[PDB]
């Protein structure tokens, strides 16, 4: 039980129900004074959900650049990775890693997708439905191609970064048979542009909660109907979790979403957990023993054994860069 991944935020974690695959993210190197120290691109860490042990694999092939904020999912044992932030900025590249392989070395493949891709961006979300991947939102450059939806600049990026960036409300579909991008024509009122929101799919509903937009970290809840492309805003019956970004939102049943952690508008790291019951349209607080372990920019993955496995993220205000306390702890929630 020696092996364990380095601490990190902004990594991805995806699951086949038995394994949790962890890639990427960043941490600090305090000796060198580096607070954007990306984790090694060729490493893939596998957390075995039954044994609680980690194994590090070195991948080959078209290994993606080291990145924070990428959007990944595992569908039928294939890892798909879109977007992110590397040392030279945001990307819209798409990578696949097929784990249905009896080869001893796992191989990344960079895919040349057809159609018009999303803009280059990070800190977004993805829904999975009927052999397609449906991406929503994010933070990145002004879109350069014809795109349906809206984009709003982050005002401070006109002086605080080398190139202006902003939030989008875009919905893009990738068909994984042909690797073709498209966009659906939606109806209803889409959520505002946002990044660092959390997405979760139950049935044909793509839920999205919270996120950052302009000067707010939000607590609104919406779903996109993945058959009809109608957006719906859900107004819960009572008290809601406070507005936040960098939280996780994970399906735990056919009727429940599990929310943990995040970062408030006033920059407080959060250790609260809640369950949203879909049929009752109500939020309920979830009692747990990690009240002194707030996390933001962690990942959460459900196991087949009725648990949510939280990994990584930052315990304190990650925007105070030199003091940001990234974690490598596994927090297990019994749901």
């Amino acid at each position: 039980e020696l092996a364990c991944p380095a601490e990190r935020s902004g990594h991805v974690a995806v699951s086949d129900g038995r394994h949790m695959f962890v890639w990427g993210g960043y941490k600090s190197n305090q000796v060198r004074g580096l607070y954007d120290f990306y984790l090694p691109r060729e490493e893939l860490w596998i957390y075995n959900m039954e044994t609680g042990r980690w194994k590090k694999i070195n991948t080959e092939g078209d290994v993606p650049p080291s990145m924070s904020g990428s959007c990944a999912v595992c569908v039928d044992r294939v890892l798909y990775l879109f977007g992110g932030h590397h040392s030279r900025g945001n990307t819209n590249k798409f990578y696949m890693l097929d784990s249905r392989s009896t080869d001893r070395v796992l191989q990344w493949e960079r895919i040349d997708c057809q159609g018009i891709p999303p803009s280059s961006k990070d800190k977004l979300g993805v829904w999975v439905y009927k052999n397609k991947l449906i991406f929503f939102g994010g933070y990145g450059y002004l879109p350069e191609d014809k795109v349906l939806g809206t984009f709003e600049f982050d005002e401070t990026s006109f002086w605080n970064s080398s190139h202006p960036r902003g939030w989008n409300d875009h919905v893009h579909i990738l068909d994984t048979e042909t690797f073709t991008w498209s966009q659906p024509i939606t109806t209803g009122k889409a959520p505002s542009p946002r990044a660092a929101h959390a997405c979760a799919t139950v049935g044909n509903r793509g839920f999205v909660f919270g996120g950052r937009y302009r000067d707010a970290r939000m607590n609104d809840l919406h779903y996109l109907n993945l058959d009809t492309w109608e957006w719906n805003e859900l107004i819960p019956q009572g008290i809601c979790p406070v507005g936040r970004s960098w939280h996780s939102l994970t399906p735990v049943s056919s009727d429940h979403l599990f929310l943990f952690g995040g970062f408030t508008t006033d920059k407080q790291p959060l250790s609260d957990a809640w369950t949203y019951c879909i049929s009752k349209n109500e939020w309920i607080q979830f009692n747990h023993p990690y009240t002194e372990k707030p996390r933001l920019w962690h990942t959460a993955c459900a196991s087949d054994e009725g648990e949510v496995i939280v990994f990584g993220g930052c315990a304190n205000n990650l925007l105070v860069h030199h003091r940001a306390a990234h974690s490598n702890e596994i927090l297990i929630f019994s749901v």
Binding site: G10, Y26, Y35, D36, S68, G69, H85, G89, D122, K123, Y139, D154, T156, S157, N160, S161, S162, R165, G166, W167, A195, A196, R212, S245, W246, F263, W297, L318, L319, H321
Partner: peptide, 7 residues
Amino acid sequence: NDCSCGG
């Protein structure tokens, strides 16, 4: 730190 902007 560009990586954390926008969240």
